[PDB]
Swiss-Prot record, chain A:
Post-translational modification remark: N-glycosylated. Full maturation of the glycan chains in the Golgi is essential for high affinity interaction with FGF19. Ubiquitinated. Subject to proteasomal degradation when not fully glycosylated.
Species per Swiss-Prot/TrEMBL record: Homo sapiens
Expression sites (tissue/organ): Expressed in gastrointestinal epithelial cells, pancreas, and gastric and pancreatic cancer cell lines.
First-to-last residue of the parent protein present: 246 to 353 of 802
Taxonomy, superkingdom: Eukaryota
Function, as annotated: Tyrosine-protein kinase that acts as a cell-surface receptor for fibroblast growth factors and plays a role in the regulation of cell proliferation, differentiation and migration, and in regulation of lipid metabolism, bile acid biosynthesis, glucose uptake, vitamin D metabolism and phosphate homeostasis. Required for normal down-regulation of the expression of CYP7A1, the rate-limiting enzyme in bile acid synthesis, in response to FGF19. Phosphorylates PLCG1 and FRS2. Ligand binding leads to the activation of several signaling cascades.
Stretches assigned to the Ig-like C2-type domain: 4-94
Cysteine pairs bridged by disulfides in the record: C26-C78
The protein's name in its UniProt record: Fibroblast growth factor receptor 4
Protein family: Belongs to the protein kinase superfamily. Tyr protein kinase family. Fibroblast growth factor receptor subfamily.
Associated pathology: FGFR4 variants may be involved in the pathogenesis of various cancers. It has been found in prostate cancer as well as cancers of the breast, colon, head and neck, larynx, lung, skin.
Annotated localization: Cell membrane; Endosome; Endoplasmic reticulum
Glycosylation: residue positions: N13, N42, N67
Subunit (UniProt): Monomer. Homodimer after ligand binding. Interacts with FGF1, FGF2, FGF4, FGF6, FGF8, FGF9, FGF16, FGF17, FGF18, FGF19, FGF21 and FGF23 (in vitro). Binding affinity for FGF family members is enhanced by interactions between FGFs and heparan sulfate proteoglycans. Interacts with KLB; this strongly increases the affinity for FGF19 and FGF23. Affinity for FGF19 is strongly increased by KLB and sulfated glycosaminoglycans.
């Protein structure tokens, strides 16, 4: 009768170089999972009314990221939810050129 | 605070309604109804980030 319970540590803030691959982790203890990215539009991740630009990416839970680019970095979030509610932990990805 | 409680109330009321409707087209109408109400409640950055996060998860149903 609760919101889903997630492993506290993950996802962890990851730093990667461009052209390399990235793996983000999520661990559910229990309940569907979908990852999200926070979209930055004109230097603002928030819209007109004050809602965030957030996009669903997929549906231990790993997310494969191959050949990361500059637009691939930002905030990633793991959404777990059930009949009662939701729980989410966010991490930030960093892309570095060569 | 008290607004955050009405959000979870709308979510659970919408979760129950979504997952008890066999008509896949009527399920989208229930999301849109919860979409407008949820956007009509939240006022803070975390509350608006919550009301958004919910909306995408009812679509996973």
């Amino acid at each position: 009768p609760h919101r889903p319970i997630l492993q506290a540590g993950l996802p962890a803030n990851t730093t990667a170089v461009v052209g390399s691959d990235v793996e983000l982790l999520c661990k559910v203890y229990s309940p569907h999972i979908q990852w999200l990215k926070h979209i930055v539009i004109n230097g603002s991740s928030f819209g007109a009314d004050g809602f965030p630009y957030v996009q669903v990416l997929k549906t231990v839970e790993v997310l494969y990221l191959r050949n990361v680019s500059a637009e691939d970095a930002g905030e990633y979030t793991c959404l777990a939810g059930n009949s009662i509610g939701l729980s989410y932990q966010s991490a930030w990805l960093t892309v570095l050129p060569e | 605070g008290d607004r955050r409680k009405e959000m979870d109330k709308v979510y659970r009321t919408a979760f129950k309604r979504i997952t008890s409707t066999p008509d896949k087209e009527k399920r989208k109408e229930v999301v849109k109804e919860a979409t407008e109400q949820l956007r009509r409640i939240a006022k803070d950055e975390e509350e608006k980030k919550k009301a958004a996060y919910m909306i995408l998860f009812l679509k996973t149903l």
